């Protein structure tokens, strides 16, 4: 998250960290035993850290659970990053507190203009490299499919939404992938990709979650 602010403690109870020796991606807890993330974050072995705030320190609130099953979307395209979504079944149900909670799935798709919250432990410097210890937050609107496509000609499928600022400055970045994009208490997007971070006319591209609700439920129901 570049140009964002530090999230207050346990302010994002549905935010999780994917770990394999260290933090490499974010994720969202949609129910006590399932986590949603980006498919390009896939790895054979993954440990999910919940209730985190400072990824560099053990605070005493965290829950460490390994992934039992890792399911990437069948139609995921590694070249265009289309259908960049992934489900992770925790090997043990998570304990819901105030420092750990689930986020709601989309009852519908967000309209352009909707303000949303983007969070993560990703790189904070757009020009250089600077990773935070404290989860960062960013409020940003959902751009229109038109402006999104004109920003990335020939690259935006119907399973992608741009969320950010055409003027650049504030945006998600490396390390934020798989992370949450919540609007009106509903998970509307997953940090996927973009051209650099906080570049003018190059807002961040995110997976359009409202297109996978049926797939998500049916997959959870069968695992």
């Amino acid at each position: 998250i570049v140009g964002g602010y530090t999230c207050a403690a346990n302010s994002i109870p549905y935010q999780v960290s994917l770990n394999s020796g260290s933090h490499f991606c974010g994720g969202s807890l949609i129910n006590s035993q399932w986590v949603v993330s980006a498919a390009h974050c896939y790895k054979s072995r993954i440990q999910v850290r919940l209730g985190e705030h400072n990824i560099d320190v053990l605070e005493g609130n965290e829950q460490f659970i390994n992934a039992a099953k890792i399911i990437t979307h069948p139609n995921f395209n590694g070249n265009t990053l289309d259908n960049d979504i992934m489900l992770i079944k925790l090997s043990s149900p998570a304990t819901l507190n105030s420092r750990v909670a689930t986020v709601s799935l989309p009852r519908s798709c967000a309209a352009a203009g909707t303000e949303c919250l983007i969070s993560g432990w990703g790189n904070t410097k757009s020009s250089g490299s600077s990773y935070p210890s404290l989860l960062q937050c960013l409020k940003a609107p959902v751009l229109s499919d038109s402006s999104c496509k004109s920003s990335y000609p020939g690259q935006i499928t119907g399973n992608m939404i741009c969320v950010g600022f055409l003027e650049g400055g504030k945006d998600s970045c490396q390390g934020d992938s798989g992370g949450p994009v919540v609007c009106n208490g509903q998970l509307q997007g997953i940090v996927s990709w973009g051209y650099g971070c906080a570049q003018k006319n190059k807002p961040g591209v995110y997976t359009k979650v409202c297109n996978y609700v049926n797939w998500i439920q049916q997959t959870i129901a069968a695992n």
Binding site: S22, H23, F24, C25, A38, H40, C41, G78, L81, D84, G122, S127, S172, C173, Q174, G175, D176, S177, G178, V191, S192, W193, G194, Y195, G196, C197, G204
Partner: protein, 53 residues
């Protein structure tokens, strides 16, 4: 667009240490050792370097 070494990258140019060219369109996951560059240079969209470069 970005100053770089002796030169300055404009518009669609990405800076590679001291030269401007390349482009840097990547996925937003962390690369323990950065994205994979090999043969041409600069980095790859969505593939980290298991070992360094």
């Amino acid at each position: 667009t970005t100053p770089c070494g002796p030169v300055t990258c404009s518009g669609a140019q990405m800076c590679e240490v001291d030269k401007c060219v390349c482009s840097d369109l990547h996925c937003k996951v962390k690369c323990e050792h950065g994205f994979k560059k090999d043969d041409n240079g600069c980095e790859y969209a969505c593939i980290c370097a298991d070992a360094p470069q």
